[PDB]
Write a protein that binds this ligand. Structure first.
Ligand SMILES: CCCCCCCC
Lengths: 339, 20
């Protein structure tokens, strides 16, 4: 318990060195080959790429300067990159390279071939409590680290957790990540995962991440989220309402834990109490979990997705291949000066 | 069943993140 505190301490120091003095233009477009698109986003897409000098595969994130701009996501894009190049945690996707060009922003990360948890979750339906618990444990720890650096993640969902070769998770998409001492007020996240304080425009803190966990956990063990409907509006209504129904297969410990994460009253919510994280690590639901073991990647994973070979894309869905178009004249230069 | 309700819902796929 003190070992943790001390860990965190050195870790904050490392982060700060990088937070105050970031990396810029460490690669070029040409140094890679575009293999396949792995996902599409709002302002960009993700592609499997291949580094010519080393023959290593990576996932390259590509953001359109112009769309980031019209969508007023400028600050958010700067944050994502600035933060990603500074963290280092076993369950965080590693940023290798970063660069930009006349029309785009690029973030090159390592490739995690197991695909999104979302695909498995959906295909299988739901996970057994022990299975989900395995995952939760990793996110608790990840949040423990992140929150320590005065960071809020803000975009927890199955779509964002990737599964590696060992069956361990990797958190991707820091598009909403923000370093903040104090409150923030941006309306952002994914409907089914938004805390009421966000929805209510109340000004929020890192406690929103904990409500998110609650949702994650419920979703994985039930196979469906606690609050769903066909139009966001309908969802917002159920979130703030305060009602939550659980499946009859939930263990009582589970129901207890989720009843605490899904606390509308920020003043009662687990994780945002004096004792923070400990209120969670100590719960009966996780009585079996050896935090240290998880951290160390010593625990045997419930499911390992088998990799056919390096560069294999079998675990991702297919998307139409647009082609990377690179302008002759620079787009939004001053806006992305620090990238 | 709720599970069935979920399945026939419109939000069974990948959810996009909101902003403003
Ligand atoms: C919040 C991260 C925990 C670090 C544990 C280190 C194990 C000796």
């Amino acid at each position: 318990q003190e070992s943790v505190k001390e860990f965190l301490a050195k870790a904050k120091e490392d982060f700060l060195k990088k937070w105050e003095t970031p990396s810029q233009n460490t690669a070029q477009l040409d140094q890679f080959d575009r293999i396949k698109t792995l996902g599409t986003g709002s302002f960009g897409r993700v592609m499997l790429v291949k580094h010519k000098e080393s023959g290593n595969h990576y996932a390259m994130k590509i953001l359109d300067k112009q769309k980031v701009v019209k969508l007023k996501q400028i600050e958010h894009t700067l944050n994502e990159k600035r933060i990603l190049q500074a963290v280092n945690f076993p369950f965080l996707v590693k940023l290798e390279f970063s660069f930009k060009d006349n029309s785009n922003l690029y973030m090159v990360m390592e490739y995690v071939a197991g695909g999104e948890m979302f695909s498995h979750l959906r295909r299988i339906g739901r996970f057994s409590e022990p299975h989900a618990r395995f995952y939760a444990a990793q996110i608790v720890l990840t949040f423990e680290y992140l929150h320590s650096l005065d960071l809020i993640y803000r975009d927890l969902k199955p779509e964002n957790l990737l599964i590696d070769q060992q069956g361990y998770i990797q958190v991707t998409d820091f598009g909403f990540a923000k370093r903040v001492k104090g409150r923030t007020w941006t309306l952002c996240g994914t409907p089914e995962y938004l805390a009421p304080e966000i929805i209510l425009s109340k000004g929020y803190n890192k406690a929103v991440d904990w409500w998110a966990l609650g949702v994650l956990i419920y979703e994985m063990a039930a196979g469906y989220p606690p609050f769903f409907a066909d139009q966001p509006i309908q969802i917002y209504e159920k979130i703030v309402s305060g009602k939550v129904r659980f499946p009859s297969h939930f263990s009582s410990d589970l129901k207890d834990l989720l009843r605490n994460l899904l606390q509308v009253d920020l003043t009662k919510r687990f994780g945002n109490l004096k004792n923070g994280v400990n209120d969670i690590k100590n719960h009966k639901w996780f009585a079996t979990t050896d935090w240290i073991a998880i951290y160390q990647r010593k625990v045997e994973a419930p499911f390992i997705p088998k990799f056919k070979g390096p560069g294999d894309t079998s675990n991702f869905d297919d998307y139409e291949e647009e082609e990377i178009r690179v302008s002759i004249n620079e787009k939004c230069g001053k806006e992305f000066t620090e990238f | 069943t709720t599970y069935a309700d979920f399945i026939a819902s419109g939000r069974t796929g990948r959810r996009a993140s909101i902003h403003d």
